[PDB]
């Protein structure tokens, strides 16, 4: 099974919490979830919406359609009706509300709504939306939310304004009812979420009222859960991976959607540790909220100099500000990880939306030549293992490492098996660290592999400088020292490229003549698209780059030789990952499926885009669905 549920409502009404409760109930019944959060750059009043994919099997991607849309306002109907396939739950009070009276709605969206309705001769009221939907076989279930709220207020002998938010749980209880799962899971999910008896009980009544007013349509059965499951978002998973990887200093400046990572680290900063002779100790991660990103990068780089594993996290505007600091870290061969939560850009761009438009900037960030190791996670499990990897790469190659996690992954959450992130050893490789044998240590010894022996502040006299320098860290302009030291640093990347197996830099799935060349978050939608297409004769393979620098040049040349279709799928305009392949190997993608609107690429967008390329060879498919 694969059922797509969505609810929506004005930011500030706790609808996100309602979505969480719904999901938590369905999950306890033994269904996997993949959920999303879509908000405006706004604290109150704009339209927010929450999509939850439900299945008995692991889910990997979102969908373009909604099976069940749950609503209690006019706006959520207007915003999603064109995607709604099977069931609308709505508020009968707004039947005569016309799209022009929804003031929180962007004018552009009001126009898109009017266009979709006018096109088939409908007017602009909710009632007209209902007809639009009945023409497509959608079943609509209208609630007098006002009467139900009056009833509950009455029962609990409070005024209506006290129980106004029960509207949310009526919409949720009716949705959950359609599924046919037993009420207790929802009742339990309500009791574990709200913190006071009155709120529990009146929300429980609200959900009962919804559940008992609708028929059991999807007839879902329960599954016993064999292996232990967890539910986590991207932010959180990066934090877990970093902590597992030994992080003990993080400096950050708040920015969406990066801040949540640091807030989680800080709330959990006192960690249990099993140390020498099996002693339980606690060890604190110092977390500093810097005053700006220039302070944040440089604080982390300074911390690394003491031998601590350090990192920061940011997004486009912040990352641009960090360029200088990253260059200094390159010059001074300082391990640091920068988690790049890549979002809708340029400038402020879409602070609450996603993108893949900053890859080549990351690959070339800051002045000078130095090794910028760059990886990108494609799904939630990869995020965990990639954060451990980043930290090991940084210390092994003594250089900044950029770990890209798109916003789409950061804020989405999924249910998966716990063992996927606990089943293997948490390896910490500290690289070429040594105990100095005197008071003065030459920090930048010139070796054949480029990697100089490393010591920490406090162990011996060492020198770092932004200027070109000799083996002692003293300012040196001499041409021959310059030649050697500048090469030594860049040789580290060649050593990395010999040491890291190319097979760890890509995930390859399938073996077929049509290649889906991607990186990052489209991985999921692509794999789900490949399965659907396979059932229909259409054979495809996925090549997903994980490490862009050092680039898996030879492996890529081998896998792509003699392929007739190489279709780059990315959330940017210039297909920057394809551009990097072309720089490194000479191989040009044949076609593109691109999306720059900020919303996740869906399974169906990939399926249809590929059909559109096989059927008529169009060069660039441009996607735009969502929100």
């Amino acid at each position: 099974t694969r059922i797509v549920w969505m609810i929506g409502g004005a930011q500030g009404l706790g609808v996100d919490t309602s979505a969480n409760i719904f999901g938590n109930a369905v999950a306890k019944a033994g269904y996997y979830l993949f959920g999303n959060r879509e908000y405006y750059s706004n604290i109150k009043g704009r339209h927010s919406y929450f999509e939850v994919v439900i299945s008995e099997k692991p889910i990997r991607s979102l969908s373009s359609y909604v099976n069940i849309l749950a609503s209690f306002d006019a706006e959520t109907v207007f915003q999603h009706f064109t995607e709604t396939k099977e069931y609308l739950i709505y508020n009968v009070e707004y039947e005569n509300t016309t799209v022009d009276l929804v003031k929180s709605m962007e004018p552009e969206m009001a126009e898109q709504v009017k266009e979709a309705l006018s096109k088939e001769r409908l007017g602009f009221t909710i009632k007209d939306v209902l007809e639009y939907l009945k023409r497509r076989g959608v079943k609509v279930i209208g609630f007098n939310y006002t009467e139900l709220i009056k009833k509950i207020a009455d029962t609990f002998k409070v005024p209506m304004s006290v129980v106004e938010r029960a509207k949310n749980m009526i919409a949720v209880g009716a949705s959950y009812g359609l599924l046919g799962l037993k009420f207790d899971y929802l009742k339990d999910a309500i009791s574990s979420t709200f913190k006071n008896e009155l709120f529990i009980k009146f929300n429980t009544m609200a959900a009962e009222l919804g559940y008992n007013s609708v028929p059991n349509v999807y007839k879902l059965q329960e599954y016993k859960i064999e292996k232990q499951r967890i539910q986590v978002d991207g932010n959180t998973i990066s934090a877990m991976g970093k902590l597992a990887g030994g992080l003990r200093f993080q400096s950050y400046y708040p920015i969406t959607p990066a801040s949540d990572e640091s807030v989680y680290i800080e709330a959990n900063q006192n960690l249990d540790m099993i140390v020498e002779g099996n002693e339980l100790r606690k060890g604190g991660v110092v977390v500093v909220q810097a005053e700006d990103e220039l302070a944040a990068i440089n604080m982390a780089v300074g911390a690394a100099l003491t031998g601590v594993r350090s990192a920061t996290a940011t997004s486009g505007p912040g990352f641009s500000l960090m360029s200088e600091g990253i260059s200094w870290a390159g010059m001074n061969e300082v391990p640091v990880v920068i988690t790049y939560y890549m979002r809708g850009a340029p400038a402020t761009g879409l602070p609450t939306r996603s993108g893949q438009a900053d890859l080549k900037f990351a690959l070339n960030v800051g002045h000078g030549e130095f090794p910028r190791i760059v990886i990108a996670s494609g799904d939630h499990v990869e995020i965990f293992w990639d954060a451990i990897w980043a930290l090991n790469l940084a210390e092994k190659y003594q250089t900044p490492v950029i770990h890209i996690i798109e916003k789409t992954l950061a804020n989405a959450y999924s249910v998966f098996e716990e063992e996927l992130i606990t089943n293997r050893p948490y390896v910490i490789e500290r690289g070429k660290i040594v105990k100095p044998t005197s008071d003065y240590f030459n920090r930048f010894e010139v070796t054949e592999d480029g990697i100089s022996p490393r010591v920490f502040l406090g162990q011996a006299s060492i020198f770092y400088t932004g200027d070109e320098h000799n083996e002692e860290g003293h300012i040196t302009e001499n041409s021959i020292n310059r030649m050697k030291m500048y090469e030594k640093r860049n040789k580290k990347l060649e050593t990395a490229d010999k040491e890291i197996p190319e097979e760890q830099r890509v995930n390859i799935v399938g073996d077929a003549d049509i290649v889906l060349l991607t990186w990052g978050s489209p991985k999921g939608a692509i794999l789900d698209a490949m399965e659907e297409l396979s059932k229909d004769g259409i054979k495809t393979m996925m090549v997903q780059v994980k490490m862009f620098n050092p680039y898996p040049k030879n492996l890529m040349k081998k896998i792509l030789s003699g392929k007739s279709k190489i279709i780059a799928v990315e959330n940017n305009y210039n297909a920057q990952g394809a551009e990097v392949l072309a720089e490194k190997t000479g191989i040009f993608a044949t076609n593109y499926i691109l999306k720059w609107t900020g919303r996740p690429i869906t399974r169906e967008e990939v399926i249809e885009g590929i059909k559109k390329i096989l059927e008529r060879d169009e060069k660039r498919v441009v996607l735009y669905g969502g929100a």
Partner: protein, 301 residues
């Protein structure tokens, strides 16, 4: 290889500051291996490189020494972290980080090389040069008002604010010692001739004008009880604006009653002083020692 040419102009005030800072570190008896001098970009910024002792130097980015220093000190608070910045570096491009240090009260000393100019880029006006002043390096009179580093530091608020003079080495040395021992963020604004650029604010100009607050009977800049704090602060502010014929030097304000950033971290991380980030054992034979079991358990279905 082994020699470092001390490349400052003969007669630069930077020689006095270097001499004074070395001596402060020696006389305090601090193990030099544990001292980190974090310096900015400019003539000023070269100072760790020229140090006699086995101190460490971290020569940073223009205006960014304080941010580096913060990461260094908070990761390993057993290091004695001293920051040497130029006036352009520290108070021009680094202004934001200069002020935010005051809010944190990290245990660091900040020594500003106040020559009135950008020495290293051929003597453009620094943020301490007064409006209308025309050094030999300026084609036209300075179009900018000066900022008073001591007044900005007080408003920020640094918990130890002092001014020294590079040509009174013994005095400067003793100020640096007190700035180092002070429990919190300390500023020493050091008046420092640049003979190459700035033929106004010379050695002879200052010799003639500087007087010690130490020689002012009853001048007491030390806050000992909370109720003293406001009066001590306003007395510091007033004094910090004395300029023409008389220029005060010495300690303007000291309040060791404000918790340090390290004291505030200890509230959230109870063993920070005993098991700070840099002391922590993060692996045993290449296997992480960090437990994330409970973190993962909290996310169970």
């Amino acid at each position: 290889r082994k020699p470092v040419f001390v490349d400052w102009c003969p007669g630069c005030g930077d020689f006095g500051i270097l001499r004074a800072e070395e001596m402060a570190i020696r006389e305090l008896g601090i193990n030099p291996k544990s001292v980190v001098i974090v310096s900015g970009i400019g003539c000023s910024g070269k100072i760790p490189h020229f140090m006699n002792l086995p101190i460490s130097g971290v020569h940073t980015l223009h205006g960014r020494s304080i941010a580096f220093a913060t990461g260094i000190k908070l990761s390993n608070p057993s290091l004695e972290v001293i920051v040497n910045v130029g006036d352009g570096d520290g108070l021009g491009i680094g202004m934001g980080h200069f002020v935010h240090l005051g809010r944190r009260n990290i245990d660091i000393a900040v020594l500003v090389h106040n020559n009135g100019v950008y020495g290293l880029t051929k003597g453009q006006a620094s943020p301490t040069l007064h409006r209308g002043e025309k050094t030999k390096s300026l084609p036209k009179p300075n179009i900018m008002d000066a900022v008073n580093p001591l007044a900005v530091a007080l408003a920020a608020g640094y918990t130890f604010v002092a001014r020294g003079y590079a040509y009174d080495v013994m005095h400067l040395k003793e100020l640096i010692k007190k700035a180092i021992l002070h429990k919190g963020s300390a500023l020493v604004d050091i008046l420092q001739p640049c003979p190459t650029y700035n033929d106004i604010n010379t050695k002879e100009w200052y010799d003639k004008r500087v007087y010690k607050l130490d020689n002012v009977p009853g001048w007491d800049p030390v806050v000992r009880k909370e109720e003293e704090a406001q009066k001590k602060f306003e007395q510091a502010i007033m004094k910090s604006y004395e300029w023409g014929e008389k220029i005060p030097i010495g300690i303007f304000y000291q309040n060791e009653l404000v918790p340090t950033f390290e004291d505030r971290l200890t509230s959230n991380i109870p063993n920070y002083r005993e098991y700070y980030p840099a002391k922590q054992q993060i692996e045993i034979n290449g296997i992480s020692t960090t437990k994330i079991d409970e973190l993962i358990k909290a996310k169970r279905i």
